[PDB]
């Protein structure tokens, strides 16, 4: 067998059947004779290839396979990798290298010091020392991406390797099962359960690894038994809990003093599937107030090490959430009462308030919609206004890197063909991976893109206000016609300048048989 | 509180009370006002500082703290780190950096690009961005070294940081408990237990993470219930099983074809606490023969990813060994029969055969002795001839880096004051960290060093034979007087040129109140 | 031709005929059939292999070739590399890697992520992607080490590569000549010459790249024409000027305020072949006083970039010193007058003052002696008391990493068989690479080692005084018998407890036909 044949066999035996790619000449020997059972998803720029794969992985809860072109293709994707690192996305990134005979002279398209290029944003990064090693290296990549804590990995392959003879002993790679589905030993688990049972005012804080694990329903059982309020950890990249459940208390503010104040009076705070914590703004104070202690369950030793307070347990989030939900006592305390509905903001017949857009989306979208956020100044309102009952219903760029939601919405919709994906993207963010629109058009992946157009980088105007920073250049982005960009890439486009047109545009988009972009004229900050 | 005071408080609250060091000027601000409850162990060169700390950590089963001088001190220790990486040793390596005001100009003793210096041989490597951050960075280092898979970490600290004010919120670091004591979820554990119960001819292979976990006695229960032979995985850095137990079958040959041949006819091979596998020699063949399947339990995702065959489970070795030993059925098969005793090699009245040295050590040493091996051409004989009943009884440089056993024997004897440590070290290996002898003399740490003197790098002469390599230079090391080197560093010294003198020298050394070196005239290969 | 044959041919064609090494099993395929025209110099530990090669390179002014064993051998040498980096030493470091077929599984002796291991202390670090590439990679290593700014480089080679067929086109590597012998263009050179001619009170500061370039005699002509005082830049690793020439003013103090004060009243300060500057102690103040401007000529862009003041020119030191010495006008100012001789320190019949040792060395040593310093608390006195008329007469560990002078003295004496090498090494420093003594004994390289025994790390006691640091542990090193360590490794040994015995020991050592160690009882600080 050739290295090509053995590698595609390994991939299909490990569950991989799709290649997200932008091709190049170092990759033609890999892509030729492309197997009939695989499907290649082209995108026009690498940040878009990786963003699509990333949404697909996160929504499918399985690794996604990427193929990029040498150094420049890999480099074009590094902002996307920054997000994938922070979301623990299982991404297997492969890039073609020059033929081994041309690497020394550094011929054009040589990826110099290849394994160092994607660092520090990958779990494992490698170039094999011979062609026969490529299937074993690919095996290592699959498992490194897929073990807890999941994350992106990188394999560089000289293009001459593919046609070489494979090692016949590579067949032992094909059916390897590797598990990291582990939980705290019985004795220590019992100590943890007794501490939860004994708490007089417990709180729960949930992060994105809960949704990744599909542990959401176990965490609802846990919060119901403990009769405990549930917050989402700050800077949330996913939604880990039904947002209209009576226990739900919303997104935590990403500040040190805000969070200790929020948690005051809670004696035991249990954090599951989040870093402790992904703060953002400068908000100095106590990490925790007197009387509050914290216990974190994380799948990631780097999170456990860097928490400034609390105990920690490094284990699988699905296994831990399930064990705790089934072991804790039913508390005799009263179940928390549901937060009230948000108020309607006054809206005239002109530009839309973001509140109005979310309220209308919530009124019209199916109950199993999936939302993506890259509307940076409207996050708090989005979280208050969208009822998200099901898992896998929210994604926001986990490292803050814009250019995620537009491609990732396409990957998510590919992963979940029966759930309507709606990406709400600011006019600033929409440009970073605008070319991804073409993939949705070409493959007919029926994502709806809602572009919030207020003409400015609104969140940066807000941070500038907090800093009291005057005379900052580069904050305005006038003069973009999103309907013309959608036409550019083959996607039906609509404009909503007021509420009547927003309703009509949403009705048409929800009825459409393909992707749709709606440019919404929003109020300027 | 100062950063100095808060950092020593963090260390003592996390169980650390000893600093293994070779001091320098960037470290004086850390070492001044050295706390009365800590103890500083000086060694004269950094490979020796790290080798001592390493033996201490491995034998104590807890992290050890090291303090070295900037770049050159850290660089002198990098071979030692190579071993510590492969043995999963929990080493917290700190090094002093220049004052922050002098780093830019690259004053003398600046550690340039400090965090990259020890890579790839550390789990985590860092320099803090401010003085107030140093206690949190130290906390991160403690936990990264201590979480499974354990390993060395590196922290660089500008010398001006220590006298700065600490953040009052650093107190939340002091009592953090972080656990990685986890095992496979119940459902999958039950599947694994049923596969073991159902095996018709199971084999067990154990590696060094079993001894690190003190899981040895659980693995004896497991092998007794399964009525299964037990091998030690190849290239063994520790001994995970009593070597005269009836199930024990010895050290596996470090070759691919040798191991598949050994395992042939075994239907399920369970590997615990080892890489799969640490092969050495070139020995191409099948990874496993038809009819054999393998299941590995490892604490290290990098081991699980790179195994060329088998299933794998990434979990704590102590938690997994205990759970399996207590859950499996007692098989009705007959218990394996003990291997026979090794034969006596003919010995005349002249130079000693290595076989004779081990046989005599076994005759005379206490039953709780601890041995270290750095006699590279005699390993197989050592394993056959020393009855090691207890855990923590054997150490051999885990990456093959010579210069480990002499210092590590001193650390081990410090960790285990009531167990006689006996290091058997070839005349070649003895030179790499010869200066460590001074530490044993100065602190009166009563290690016995047995130097196997055959005048040559014997194992390299053997590998040269296997390669059929002629005219190789640099293989002979004549003209070293080990009794004079021991005198140099204050250690009592004895010579054994025949068996009568070997017996007398061992009797005197075993009776001594301090360290002793015995130079033994061994047969030339 | 094989890769082995083509590589040794490349080496001899590029002037390399000696391999400094400590062998291992990954290197046997390289070392077999060792060519009859090469010479292998064995040392017992890698810091000693690299220190010997380093002295040899620095004194010979040509690259030296090193061969080490995989990761642990390379790691044992990293402190030595830290020095070699700061001295711009042209060192070609090769290390053996596992066979390519065993790298993936990480067999024992695999050097993982090999090219990153020696960073940041090398100019270039690489592992070839195929066997046929090895001679080109070796060519790259030779030239990267040898081009200005010279420095260490690293090549990792899988052991199976050597017996493979070489590319017949590799012959084009054999006779490549690569020059970096360059100087500032004529127009800008003329501007610089006119500025020097016009200076009313010029000063010259010289660093180690002057001695490396053998530009010393040109700098004497330059200082004589400009009638300018000459200082050696701080933290000096080499001596660039005759120390009894009338222009010589000694070693600059390594502090910011000290140097600006020293230079005050000098209108133009010309620095040649040094960083600007290698400060050490904390000594805040003005980089330069009003009225002083600085112009640096360096062979190293990293030095030019990081100078906090002055203009800079990046060019070859030999070409620039020669051009300036021949172009500048003879000034009509009076030639500087020679510094007076140092005074005799009162010495009784007991322990030796360091002043007395240097005074006696200066009285007895040949006028072409070469000295090495690793007596850290006595540097200023050494510089005042040794008349060093010739180039290549002084070496001190350029990064401050102890363990350099003892091995490097052996390399220097190998490079300069007709110049008596005398290494003055403190009792603390002597331990770091003590095993190097064996190389001098085995090859009969007649270095004289003068061990300054005061029982303590004296310079650290001094820095502790400056810091006002009390209760510092680990500063004393009692209980070392250097005569016994020399006997250990086959080197004749003498003791001097007073001046009479110092004189007699020096007379005997200067008369000896092989290496000699003298342990000198010096006054305690
Ligand atoms: C790749 C990339 N480039 C730049 C940025 C900086 N940045 C961002 C940030 O540095 C801040 C990110 C942040 C931080 C905390 C919480 N949420 C977001 S926001 C932004 C403007 C986006 O404008 P738009 O999409 O029109 O939405 P709003 O009008 O609602 O704000 C910018 C430019 C970024 N985050 N990522
Ligand atoms: C830091 C370092 N430097 C070099 C080496 C290479 N090496 C070694 C290796 O490359 C091989 C290591 C090895 C490989 C597999 C199994 N066991 C050991 S062995 C050795 C000689 C040691 O001689 P000595 O202590 O006198 O014992 P024997 O006479 O019984 O053999 C050498 C030099 C090494 N392993 N580590
Ligand atoms: C590899 C290594 N390890 C540690 C150090 C730290 N250090 C040193 C330093 O951190 C300081 C180096 C320095 C700094 C500026 C100028 N000169 C030297 S000096 C030293 C003691 C050496 O003792 P000894 O040889 O007996 O001579 P003296 O009695 O005359 O001082 C030590 C230990 C070091 N420089 N290098
Ligand atoms: Mg906007
Ligand atoms: Mg030997
Ligand atoms: Mg001293």
SS3 readout for B151-188:
CCEEEEEEHHHCCCECCHHHHHHCCCCEECCEEECHHH
Q: C404 to chain B: nearest residue by CA?
A: B72
For chain A, domain boundaries: 1-178, 179-340, 341-525
Roughly what angle, to the nearest 10 degrees, separates helices A317-327 and A186-198? 60
Strands (E), C73-200: 91-97, 125-126, 153-158
Whole-angstrom distance, CA of residue A149 vs CA of residue C150: 44
**Length of chain B (residues):** 525
Q: What was the experiment behind these coordinates?
A: X-ray
Sheet containing strand B178-179, strands side by side: A248-251, A230-232, A203-206, A268-272, A293-298, A311-314, B178-179
Whole-angstrom distance, CA of residue C447 vs CA of residue B260: 55
Whole-angstrom distance, CA of residue A306 vs CA of residue B153: 14
Q: Are C436 and C407 in contact (CB under 8 A)?
A: yes
- CATH C-level class of A1-178: alpha beta
Task: State the greatest distance between any 2 C-alpha atoms of chain C, in Å, as a whole number.
Answer: 74
Is the preceding omega at residue B502 within 30 degrees of 0, hence cis? Answer: no
Q: Cα of C27 to ligand 2 centre, how many Å?
A: 12
Name the residue among A54, A57, A21, A27 with its Cα closest to residue A39: A21
Whole-angstrom distance, CA of residue A208 vs CA of residue A74: 26
Tokens 């219903």 appear where?
A393
CATH 1.10.3720.10, applies to C179-340: no
Q: Are C369 and C424 in contact (CB under 8 A)?
A: no
Whole-angstrom distance, CA of residue B184 vs CA of residue B297: 10
Residues less than 5 Å from ion ligand 4, measured at CB? A 426-428, 454, 458
Q: Cα of A414 to ligand 4 centre, how many Å?
A: 27
Whole-angstrom distance, CA of residue C255 vs CA of residue C282: 7
The torsion angles phi and psi of C427, rounded to 5 degrees, stand at -65, -30
Sheet containing strand B248-251, strands side by side: A178-179, B311-314, B293-298, B268-272, B203-206, B230-232, B248-251
Q: How many CB atoms lie within 10 A of CB A26?
A: 25
Whole-angstrom distance, CA of residue C417 vs CA of residue C408: 14
Question: Do A341-525 and A179-340 have the same topology in CATH?
Answer: yes
DSSP per residue over A283-312, as a string? Answer: --S-SS-TT-EEEEEES-HHHHHH-SSSEE
Sign of CA dihedral C160, C162, C164, C169: positive
Give the DSSP H or E segment for B268. strand B268-272
Sign of CA dihedral C79, C82, C87, C90: positive
Strands A91-97 and A64-69 come out as: parallel
Which of the 8 DSSP states describes residue C522? Answer: B
Tokens 């001046």 appear where?
C499
Ligand at shortest distance from the CA of C402: 3
Chain A residue numbers touching B143 (CB-CB < 8 A): 301, 304-305
C464-480 burial, b at 16+ Cβ within 10 Å, e below that, comes to beebebeebbbbebeeb
Residue A248 C-beta-side C-alpha neighbours within 13 Å: 20
Give the DSSP H or E segment for C502. helix C499-511
C-alpha A258: how far from chain center: 25
List, in sequence order, the alpha helices (H) in B199-327.
Answer: 208-212, 216-226, 256-263, 301-306, 317-327
Q: Are B405 and B425 in contact (CB under 8 A)?
A: yes
Q: Are A287 and A266 in contact (CB under 8 A)?
A: no
First to last CA, chain B: 62
To test the pocket of ligand 3, the residue of C47, C460, C480, C521 to mutate (highest count of ligand atoms within 8 Å of its CB) is: C460
Q: Distance from B179 to chain A by nearest Cα, in Å?
A: 5
Whole-angstrom distance, CA of residue C382 vs CA of residue C377: 10
To test the pocket of ligand 2, the residue of B376, B401, B434, B476 to mutate (highest count of ligand atoms within 8 Å of its CB) is: B376
Superfamily of domain B341-525: Thiamin diphosphate (ThDP)-binding fold, Pyr/PP domains (3.40.50.970)
Give the C-alpha distances (Å, rounded to integers) separating A519 from A393, A425, A484, A498, B337.
22, 10, 10, 11, 80
Burial group, residue C103, by CB count within 10 angstroms (0-12, 13-18, 19+) = buried
Sheet containing strand C311-314, strands side by side: C248-251, C230-232, C203-206, C268-272, C293-298, C311-314
Q: How many CB atoms lie within 10 A of CB B420?
A: 18
DSSP SS3 for C313: strand
Sign of CA dihedral C461, B73, B124, A147: negative
Whole-angstrom distance, CA of residue C477 vs CA of residue A327: 60
Strands B182-184 and A182-184 come out as: antiparallel
Q: How many CB atoms lie within 10 A of CB A384?
A: 17
Which of the 8 DSSP states describes residue C272? Answer: E
Cα Rg of chain A (Å, integer): 24
Burial group, residue B15, by CB count within 10 angstroms (0-12, 13-18, 19+) = exposed
**Length of chain C (residues):** 525
Give the DSSP H or E segment for C163. none
Name the residue among B51, B40, B43 with its Cα closest to residue B81: B51
Which of the 8 DSSP states describes residue B36? Answer: T
* Tokens read off for A444: 């007919």
DSSP SS3 for A6: helix
* Tokens read off for B282: 């070139």
Whole-angstrom distance, CA of residue C425 vs CA of residue C376: 8
Tokens 């290698």 appear where?
C278
Which of the 8 DSSP states describes residue C249? Answer: E
Chain A residue numbers touching C104 (CB-CB < 8 A): 128-129, 133, 136-137, 140
* Tokens read off for B27: 């470290």
Q: Which residues contact A504 (CB under 8 A, 6 or more apart)?
A: A496
Q: How many CB atoms lie within 10 A of CB A507?
A: 11
Q: Is the CB of A208 under 6 A from ligand 1?
A: no
Q: Which of the residues C46, C127, C303, C374 is marked catalytic? A: C46
Sign of CA dihedral A300, A302, A308, A313: positive
Sign of CA dihedral A397, A401, A403, A408: negative
Q: Which residues contact A56 (CB under 8 A, 6 or more apart)?
A: A18, A20, A64, A411, A412, A414, A415
Whole-angstrom distance, CA of residue C84 vs CA of residue C139: 20
C-alpha A360: how far from chain center: 25
Name the residue among C436, C446, C228, C184 with its Cα closest to residue C324: C184
Q: Are C230 and C266 in contact (CB under 8 A)?
A: no
**Length of chain A (residues):** 525
* Tokens read off for B420: 């006689």
* Tokens read off for C481: 């018998």
* Tokens read off for C7: 């590589």
Helix-, strand-, coil-residue percentages of chain A, each rounded to 5: 40, 20, 40
Tokens 């403190």 appear where?
C426
Q: How many CB atoms lie within 10 A of CB C5?
A: 15
The residue whose CA has the least distance to atom 28 of ligand 3 is C458
Q: C122 to chain B: nearest residue by CA?
A: B117
Give the DSSP H or E segment for B248. strand B248-251
Chain C residue numbers touching B27 (CB-CB < 8 A): none
Tokens 């001619």 appear where?
C197
Query: B7: annotated binding-site residue?
Result: no
Whole-angstrom distance, CA of residue C162 vs CA of residue C4: 5
* Tokens read off for B495: 């010579």
Q: Distance from A33 to chain C by nearest Cα, in Å?
A: 26
C-alpha A36: how far from chain center: 30
Give the DSSP H or E segment for B280. none
Sign of CA dihedral B194, B195, B197, B203: negative
* Tokens read off for C357: 């040792």
Whole-angstrom distance, CA of residue C211 vs CA of residue C59: 9
Whole-angstrom distance, CA of residue A271 vs CA of residue A208: 11
Region of residue B417 (phi > 0: left; psi between -120 and 50: alpha; otherwise: beta) = alpha
Q: Which residues contact C306 (CB under 8 A, 6 or more apart)?
A: B104, B105, B106, C275
Of ligand 3's listed atoms, the one at least distance from the Cα of C428 is: 26
Strands (E), C125-232: 125-126, 153-158, 203-206, 230-232
Give the C-alpha distances (Å, rounded to integers) separating B471 from B463, C21, C369, C377.
13, 15, 37, 46
Whole-angstrom distance, CA of residue A373 vs CA of residue A376: 8
Whole-angstrom distance, CA of residue A123 vs CA of residue A442: 33
DSSP per residue over A205-267, as a string? Answer: EE-HHHHHTT-HHHHHHHHHHHT--EEEPSS-SB--S-TTSTTEEEEPPS-HHHHHHHHTT-S
Of ligand 2's listed atoms, the one at least distance from the Cα of B430 is: 25
Resolution in A: 1.3
């Amino acid at each position: 067998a050739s290295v090509h044949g053995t590698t595609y066999e390994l991939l299909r035996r490990q569950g991989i059947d799709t290649v997200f790619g932008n091709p190049g000449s170092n990759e033609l020997p890999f892509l030729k004779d492309f197997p009939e059972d695989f499907r290649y998803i082209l995108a026009l720029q690498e940040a878009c290839v990786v963003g699509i794969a990333d949404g697909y992985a996160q929504a499918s809860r399985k690794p996604a396979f990427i193929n990029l072109h040498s150094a420049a293709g890999t480099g074009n994707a590094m902002g996307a990798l920054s997000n994938a690192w922070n979301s623990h996305s299982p991404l297997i990134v492969t890039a073609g290298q020059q033929t081994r005979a041309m690497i020394g002279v550094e011929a054009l398209l040589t990826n110099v010091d290849a394994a160092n290029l994607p660092r520090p944003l990958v779990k494992w990064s490698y170039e094999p020392a011979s062609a026969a090693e490529v299937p074993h290296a690919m095996s290592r990549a699959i498992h490194m991406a897929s073990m807890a804590p999941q994350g992106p990995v990188y394999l560089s392959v000289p293009y001459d390797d593919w046609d070489k003879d494979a090692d016949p002993q590579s067949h032992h790679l094909f059916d390897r099962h590797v598990s990291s589905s582990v939980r705290l030993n019985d004795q220590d688990l019992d100590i943890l359960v007794k501490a939860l049972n004994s708490a007089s005012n417990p709180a729960i804080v949930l992060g994105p690894d809960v949704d990744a694990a599909n542990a959401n329903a176990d965490c609802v059982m846990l919060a119901e038994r403990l009769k405990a309020p549930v917050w989402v950890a700050p800077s949330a990249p996913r939604c880990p809990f039904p947002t209209r459940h009576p226990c739900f208390r919303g997104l935590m503010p990403a500040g040190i003093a805000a969070i200790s104040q929020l948690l005051e009076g809670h004696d035991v705070v249990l954090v599951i599937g989040a870093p402790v914590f992904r703060y953002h703004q400068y908000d100095p104070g106590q990490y925790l107030k007197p009387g509050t202690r914290l216990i974190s369950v994380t799948c990631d030793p780097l999170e456990a090490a860097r928490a400034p307070m609390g105990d920690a347990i490094v284990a699988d989030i699905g296994a831990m959430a399930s064990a705790l939900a089934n072991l804790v006592e039913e508390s005799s305390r009263q179940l928390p009462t549901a937060a009230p509905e948000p108020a309607k903001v006054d809206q005239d017949a002109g530009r839309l308030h973001p509140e109005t857009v979310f309220d209308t989306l919530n009124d019209m979208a199916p109950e199993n919609a999936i939302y993506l956020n890259e509307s940076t100044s409207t996050t708090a309102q989005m979280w208050q206004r969208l009822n998200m009952r099901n898992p896998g219903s929210y994604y926001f760029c986990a490292a803050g890197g814009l250019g995620f939601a537009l491609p990732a919405a396409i990957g998510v919709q590919l992963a979940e063909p029966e759930r309507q994906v709606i990406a709400v993207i600011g006019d600033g963010s929409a440009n970073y991976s605008i070319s991804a629109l073409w993939t949705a058009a070409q493959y007919n992946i029926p994502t709806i893109f809602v572009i919030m157009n207020n003409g400015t980088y609104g969140a940066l105007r807000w941070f500038a206000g907090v800093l009291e920073a005057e005379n900052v250049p580069g904050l305005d982005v006038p003069g973009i016609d999103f309907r013309a960009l959608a036409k550019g890439y083959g996607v039906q486009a609509l404009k909503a300048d007021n509420l009547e047109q927003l309703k009509g545009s949403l009705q048409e988009a929800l009825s459409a048989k393909g992707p749709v972009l709606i440019e919404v004229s929003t109020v300027s900050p």
